[PDB]
Design a protein around this ligand. Structure first.
Ligand code: B12
Ligand SMILES: C[S@@+](CC[C@H](N)C(=O)[O-])C[C@H]1O[C@@H](n2cnc3c(N)ncnc32)[C@H](O)[C@@H]1O
Ligand code: SF4
Length: 729
C-alpha cells in the first residue's frame, strides 16, 4: 500500500466515521465495502473500535499482517496498541494515522474483543416519551474509547419487548450482559433475569450477568436471594465493566473487580471498593446507537456534564450511589460532547434542546473557579452558528449566598447571565421549603428570604423557572411550618419579568433586585411563587440511606412511637420507607392532599394532554384551566389550615379568592383535625373545583374546546361530577 493510497483510505474512513449515529456493525459494513472496492489487497477480517474522534479500523490480512487506520487521532494514543506494546511508536515523530504491524502474533489476541450487551429497562406505559439513555450510553462509549469490548445497546424506551431482548441476546452471544434497573423496574428486571438464566442453563447463552443503577445498589439482598451468582454494580459502571472484562481474560479475580457486591462461595456478601471514575477525561460522548429510534418517538437529547454533588447535605437526598464529591467534565469535553449530540440530533431532525442530567450543574471547585468554567462553556456555545436551548438544575445558593462576599454574588449573577445568553431555558431550583425550621430539617442550608432572592435574580435574567417544593414532612409538629410555607408560596415579590440590562453593571442590577423595593415592584410579574412549583402539595418520601430516615428512626426511639411501617423494612422496588407522621393532624392533611390529587387526576391529565396538541386559542383556554386548578389546589390547603387554626389575615385572603371568582357563597367544626372533619372540609372546597369544571364542560359543549376522538374529556368530566364528595381512595 502506497503512502498516497493510505491518504485515500483515511479520507473515506473519516467520512464513514463522521456518521456517529450509525451502529458499529453498520460502520463496519461501510468499511468492508470500501476495502473490497479498490481490490488492491484482500483481507481476512475487520474490526472497528474507538468512538467519535478516535474511531479506529483494524484490517487483519492475517495474524502476521494487521493494518490500523485512525483518521481522527494520532495512532500513538491508541489504548489497545499501548496495552499490547507500550513502546511500539516513536516519540519524536509527526502524528501517525496508519501503521501496518508485521509478525505481531499477540496483537491478534488483543483484537479479539469480548462482547458486552447493555439493556436499559423501561416500563413504557409510565414513560411514553424517551430520552437518550446516558446510563447505558456512557458505559458503551467508555468501553469503545478504551477499545475494551464490542458493545451492543438495547433500550426498552423505544418499544423493545422482553421477548425481543432475549432474541437479541441469543443472536449476539455476549460475554457480559448488563441491565440498568431503575425505580419501579424490579418486576421487569426479575422477568428478564429469569429468562436470561433459563437460557444460560439451557446452553443458549454463557455470560457474566451484572445489574446496575440505584435499585440493586441499595437493595442487593433481594437480588442475591433469587440470583446468587449475580454481580451488582454499586456505583459507577465504567471501571466495573472494565474489570469484568479483565476477569473474563483471567487477569483479575472476582474480589479485585471494581465496585461490585457479590456472594462469595461461603455465602457471605462481599463489597469491593469502587474507585471514583476519572470522569473529566475518560468518559466521552454517550453512544448514539439508539438516537434514530428515539427520534421516531420524538425523544429528547441529554448530557451529563458533571457527576455528584459537592454539597451533599440535604437530609432527604441519599449520597451513597451518586457520591459526595463533584466531578466536572472539562470545558473542552463539554463543548465537544454537546457538538456531537447536537450534530447527531440535527441529522434526525431532533430540535436543538439539551436536558442536562447533572445533579448540580454549577458545582464548586477547591480553587473557586467553577463560575469561570460555566462562563467558558457558555462562551463556547455562543461561538456556534446555531442557537441552542438547555435545561439544568441548581441549588438556590448557586445563585445567591449572603454568607459569601458581594463580589462572589455579583460574579455569580454574571455567570447566570451568560447561561441565559447561551440558551438556558427552564431551570429547576431545589427551593424545597418556605419555612426556616423546615429548611433546617431538610438540611438545605438556605433561608426562605434567600430563596426569594435567588428566584428574583434568575427570573430577572429571562430564564424560566421550576422549583421543587416539599410541603409536608413527617417530623413536622403543628401547623406553623405549613403557614410559613403558604405565605412564602403566595409572595408576589419573587418572580421578575425579564429585565433589560440596558447600561447597568452587574453590581447595579444585583443591588436593585436585593434592596430597591420600587425596582422590584416595577419589574415583578405579579404571579405568586406557587405558580412555578413542580408538584403541588407534595409530601416527603423517605429514601433508604438518608439522614432524614435516621432522624425518623431517632424520633421513633426518643418518643417511643412507631413511625416506620412495614416492620421497619424498606421497599426494594421504590428504594424508600413507608412512614407515618409524628403529628397526626399533619399526616391527615398530607393524606387529604393526596386524595385531592387522586380525585382530579383523570380530568386534569386529559386537559393537559389536549393542551399539548391544541390550536393557539384553545391552548390558552386549556392552560387557563390548569392555572385555575393549581390556584384552587393551593388554596385548598390554605382553607384546611384555616379551619384548623383560623387567623384574620388568612380569612381575608380566602374571602378575596372566593370573591374574585364570583363564588363567595358557594361556601357556607373548628380546630378539629380528625380525618372525618378534614374530609368534610375538603368536600366543601371541592365545590370550587366543580365550578371550574362546569366551565370546562360548558366550553366543551359550546365547541370552544375540542375533545379527543375517544371522548376522553367528556368521559372524565362525567365521572368527576358523579364522584363528587365520594373519597373512596
Ligand atoms: C432523568 C432523571 C429522571 C427522569 C427519568 C428518565 C428516564 N430515563 O426514564 C425522571 C424525571 C422521570 C425522574 C424521576 C425520578 N427521579 Co430522577 N433523575 C434523573 C437524572 C436527572 C438523570 C439520570 C441520568 O441520566 N443519570 C446519568 C447516568 C450516567 O447515571 P446513572 O443512571 O446512575 O448510571 C451510572 C450508574 O448508575 C451505573 N449504572 C447504571 N446502569 C447500569 C447498568 C449496568 C449493567 C452497570 C454495570 C452499571 C450501571 O453506571 C452508570 C455510569 O457510571 C438523575 C440525576 C443524575 N445525574 O443521575 C435523577 C435522579 C436519578 N432521580 C432521583 C429521584 C429521587 C427521582 C424520583 C423518585 C423523583 C423525586 N425526586 O421524588 C423519580 C422516580 C420516578 C420513577 N421512575 O418511579 C435521584 C435518585 C436518588 C439518589 N439521590 O441517588 C436522582 C439522583 C436525583 C436527586 N438527587 O434527587 N428522574
Ligand atoms: C427534581 S430532582 C433535582 C434535585 C437536584 N439535586 C437539585 O439540587 O436541584 C429533586 C427534586 O425532587 C423533589 N424530591 C426529591 N426527593 C424527594 C423526596 N424524597 N420526597 C419528596 N420530594 C422529593 C424535591 O423537591 C427536589 O427538589
Ligand atoms: S438535593 Fe440537590 S443539592 Fe441537595 S444533596 Fe441532593 S443533589 Fe445535592
Amino acid at each position: 500500500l502506497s503512502t498516497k493510497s493510505i491518504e485515500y483510505y483515511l479520507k473515506e474512513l473519516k467520512e464513514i466515521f463522521s456518521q456517529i449515529w450509525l451502529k458499529p456493525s453498520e460502520i463496519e459494513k461501510r468499511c468492508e465495502e470500501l476495502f473490497k472496492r479498490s481490490k488492491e489487497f484482500d483481507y481476512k477480517r475487520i474490526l472497528v473500535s474507538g468512538e467519535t474522534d478516535n474511531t479506529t479500523l483494524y484490517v487483519i490480512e492475517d495474524s502476521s499482517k494487521i493494518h490500523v487506520f485512525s483518521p481522527n487521532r494520532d495512532l500513538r494514543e491508541n489504548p489497545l496498541l499501548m496495552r499490547w506494546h507500550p513502546s511500539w511508536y516513536e516519540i519524536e515523530s509527526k502524528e501517525i494515522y496508519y501503521k501496518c504491524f508485521l509478525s505481531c502474533e499477540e496483537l491478534y489476541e488483543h483484537l479479539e474483543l469480548p462482547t458486552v450487551t447493555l439493556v436499559n429497562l423501561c416500563v413504557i406505559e409510565n414513560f411514553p416519551i424517551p430520552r437518550l439513555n446516558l446510563s447505558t450510553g456512557t458505559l458503551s462509549s467508555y468501553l469503545r474509547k478504551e477499545q475494551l469490548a464490542k458493545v451492543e445497546l438495547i433500550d426498552m424506551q423505544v418499544g423493545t419487548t422482553i421477548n425481543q431482548i432475549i432474541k437479541n441476546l441469543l443472536d449476539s452471544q455476549p460475554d457480559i450482559i448488563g441491565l440498568s434497573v431503575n425505580f419501579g423496574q424490579k418486576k421487569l428486571a426479575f422477568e428478564i433475569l429469569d429468562l436470561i438464566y433459563s437460557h444460560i442453563e439451557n446452553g443458549d447463552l454463557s455470560s457474566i450477568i451484572t445489574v446496575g443503577n440505584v435499585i440493586p445498589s441499595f437493595s442487593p439482598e433481594q437480588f442475591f436471594e433469587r440470583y446468587p451468582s449475580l454481580l451488582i454494580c454499586d456505583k459507577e459502571g465504567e471501571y466495573t465493566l472494565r474489570d469484568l472484562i479483565k476477569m473474563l481474560k483471567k487477569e483479575l479475580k472476582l474480589d479485585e473487580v471494581n465496585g461490585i457486591s457479590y456472594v462469595d462461595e461461603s455465602g457471605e456478601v462481599k463489597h469491593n471498593v469502587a474507585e471514583t471514575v476519572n470522569f473529566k477525561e475518560e468518559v466521552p460522548t454517550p453512544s448514539l446507537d439508539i438516537l434514530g429510534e428515539i427520534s421516531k418517538f420524538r425523544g429528547a437529547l441529554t448530557l451529563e456534564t458533571s457527576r455528584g454533588c459537592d454539597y451533599s447535605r440535604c437530609t432527604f437526598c441519599p449520597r451513597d450511589h451518586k457520591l459526595r464529591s463533584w466531578r466536572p467534565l472539562s470545558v473542552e469535553q463539554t463543548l465537544k460532547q454537546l457538538d456531537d449530540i447536537l450534530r447527531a440530533g440535527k441529522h434526525f431532525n431532533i430540535k436543538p434542546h439539551i436536558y442536562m442530567a447533572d445533579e448540580e450543574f454549577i458545582g464548586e471547585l477547591p480553587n473557586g473557579t467553577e463560575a469561570q468554567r460555566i462562563i467558558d462553556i457558555c462562551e463556547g456555545l455562543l461561538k456556534r452558528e446555531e442557537k441552542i436551548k438547555f435545561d439544568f438544575a441548581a441549588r438556590a445558593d448557586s445563585v445567591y449566598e449572603p454568607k459569601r462576599t458581594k463580589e462572589w454574588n455579583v460574579e455569580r449573577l454574571k455567570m447566570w447571565h451568560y447561561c441565559a445568553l447561551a440558551g438556558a431555558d427552564r431551570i429547576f431550583i431545589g427551593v424545597e421549603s418556605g419555612s426556616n425550621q423546615q429548611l433546617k430539617r431538610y438540611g438545605k442550608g438556605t433561608t426562605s428570604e434567600q430563596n426569594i432572592i435567588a428566584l428574583r435574580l434568575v427570573s430577572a435574567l429571562g430564564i424560566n423557572l421550576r422549583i421543587g417544593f416539599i410541603m409536608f414532612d413527617q417530623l413536622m409538629k403543628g401547623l406553623d411550618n405549613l403557614k410559613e410555607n403558604l405565605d412564602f408560596l403566595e409572595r408576589t415579590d419573587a418572580l421578575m419579568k425579564p429585565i433589560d440590562i440596558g447600561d447597568m453593571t452587574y453590581e447595579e442590577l444585583y443591588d436593585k433586585l436585593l434592596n430597591d423595593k420600587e425596582f422590584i415592584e416595577k419589574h415583578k410579574t405579579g404571579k405568586p411563587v406557587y405558580t412555578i412549583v413542580s408538584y403541588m402539595l407534595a409530601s416527603m418520601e423517605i429514601l433508604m440511606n438518608t439522614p432524614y430516615s435516621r432522624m425518623v428512626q431517632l424520633t421513633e426511639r426518643k418518643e417511643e412511637v412507631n413511625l416506620i411501617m412495614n416492620d421497619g423494612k424498606p421497599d426494594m422496588n421504590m428504594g424508600r420507607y413507608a412512614t407515618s407522621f409524628v403529628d397526626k393532624t399533619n399526616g391527615n392533611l398530607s393524606e387529604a392532599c393526596q386524595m385531592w390529587i387522586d380525585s382530579n387526576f383523570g380530568v386534569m391529565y386529559t386537559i393537559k394532554s389536549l393542551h399539548k396538541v391544541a390550536n393557539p386559542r384553545e391552548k390558552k383556554k386549556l392552560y387557563s384551566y390548569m392555572e385555575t386548578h393549581r390556584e384552587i389546589s393551593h388554596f385548598l390547603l390554605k382553607y384546611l389550615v384555616y379551619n384548623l387554626s383560623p387567623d384574620k389575615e388568612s380569612q381575608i385572603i380566602l374571602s378575596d379568592f372566593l370573591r374574585m371568582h364570583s363564588m363567595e357563597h358557594i361556601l357556607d367544626n373548628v380546630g378539629d383535625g380528625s380525618k372525618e372533619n378534614i374530609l368534610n372540609v375538603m368536600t366543601n372546597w371541592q365545590l370550587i373545583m366543580e365550578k371550574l369544571l362546569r366551565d370546562v364542560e360548558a366550553d366543551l359543549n359550546k365547541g370552544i374546546i375540542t375533545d379527543s376522538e375517544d371522548h376522553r374529556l367528556h368521559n372524565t368530566l362525567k365521572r368527576w361530577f358523579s364522584d363528587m364528595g365520594n373519597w373512596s381512595l
